[PDB]
Design a protein around this ligand. Structure first.
Ligand SMILES: [Zn+2]
Ligand SMILES: [Zn+2]
Length: 180
């Protein structure tokens, strides 16, 4: 009714309610939006942006203990991946077949027109390591001349390796750092 509750260990992967360009005021600005939006919908967990930053590899964002066996689920608790570790194995973040990703407000980012381009910013290599030459100057710039690594959500993969212009407005995801 007013709080989302889970009775099994799971980590939520949820999308911000609006696409963002590479200029997010740094990782702190992206993390903050993740926190606000999670709280505004009753999620009790600690949400951080699914991105690599100047001083942070995407892989290490989730607590080590929860990396090997806690399923990654969407807003509606549907399983996207059996573990955090599975995404960064070299599979390029292959999601489960037919998997869906909802924004905190409950919209299906892939089917809803509010997200014009079906790509996700990540700025990481396939192992979740920061790409210092491709992460929009640590998410501080939306200039056409700079790039950040992105992935086409239509491929069913979160970690494809495409260097996109920072001016683009792509989907930004938020991952819970530890369960319940
Ligand atoms: Zn309630
Ligand atoms: Zn849940």
């Amino acid at each position: 009714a007013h709080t989302h509750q889970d009775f099994q260990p799971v980590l939520h992967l949820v999308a911000l309610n609006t696409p963002l360009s590479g200029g997010m005021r740094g990782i702190r600005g992206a993390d903050f939006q993740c926190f606000q939006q999670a709280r505004a919908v009753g999620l009790s967990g600690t949400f951080r942006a699914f991105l690599s930053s100047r001083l942070q590899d995407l892989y290490s964002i989730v607590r080590r203990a929860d990396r090997g066996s806690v399923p990654i689920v969407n807003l509606k608790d549907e399983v996207l991946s059996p573990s955090w570790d599975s995404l960064f194995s070299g599979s390029q973040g292959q999601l489960q077949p037919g998997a869906r990703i909802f924004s905190f407000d409950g919209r299906d980012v892939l089917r809803h027109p509010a997200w014009p381009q079906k790509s996700v910013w990540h700025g990481s290599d396939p192992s979740g390591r920061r790409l210092m030459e491709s992460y929009c100057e640590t998410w501080r710039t939306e200039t056409t001349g700079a790039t950040g690594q992105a992935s086409s959500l239509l491929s069913g993969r979160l970690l494809e390796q495409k260097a996109a212009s920072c001016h683009n407005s792509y989907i930004v995801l938020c991952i819970e750092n530890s369960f319940m």
